[PDB]
């Protein structure tokens, strides 16, 4: 049963990360990204007001808002920190979408994010050491 397999894998990964170990390189990247997001959001709220509700998201304007914010973010450059900002932005978009009962946007926001990573961030990422470098730099924080 894949369901059970995925469960065992998720659980074991969580337990390994709690000790500074990792189930796989993908797992360590995930754990690093989650932690960097928490830290980034913490440092964001202590300086500003929630990145979540500010923009008025609607199914019809969501994409455009995502694109405007995201293009200005990497207009003059890409770096790990901005990527974390990006991930955290997408995350707040989804949280806001669910709060406002536009649950269907979450899978779209998800797609728009992977697409933007695959197309516009991957090049820089490969060129700068891949995600393993990201893990060295933001791992276990």
């Amino acid at each position: 049963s894949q369901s059970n397999r995925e469960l065992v894998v998720d659980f074991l990964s969580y337990k390994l990360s709690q000790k500074g170990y990792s189930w796989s390189q993908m797992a360590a990247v995930k754990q690093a990204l989650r932690e960097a997001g928490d830290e980034f959001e913490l440092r964001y709220r202590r300086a500003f007001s929630d990145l979540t509700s500010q923009l008025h998201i609607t199914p019809g304007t969501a994409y455009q808002s995502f694109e405007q914010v995201v293009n200005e973010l990497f207009r003059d450059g890409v770096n790990w920190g901005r990527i974390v900002a990006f991930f955290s932005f997408g995350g707040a978009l989804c949280v806001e979408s669910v709060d406002k009962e536009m649950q269907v946007l979450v899978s779209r926001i998800a797609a728009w994010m992977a697409t933007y990573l695959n197309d516009h961030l991957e090049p820089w990422i490969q060129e700068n050491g891949g995600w393993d470098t990201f893990v060295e730099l933001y791992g276990n924080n």
Binding site: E39, F40, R43, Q54, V69, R82
Partner: peptide
């Protein structure tokens, strides 16, 4: 409005940038 976006991008860029610099 739309001015909210410029402002959000800016706050995200500085926050990230500071975050990047503090890991070097």
């Amino acid at each position: 409005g739309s001015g909210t976006m410029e402002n959000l991008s800016r706050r995200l860029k500085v926050t990230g940038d500071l975050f990047d610099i503090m890991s070097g």
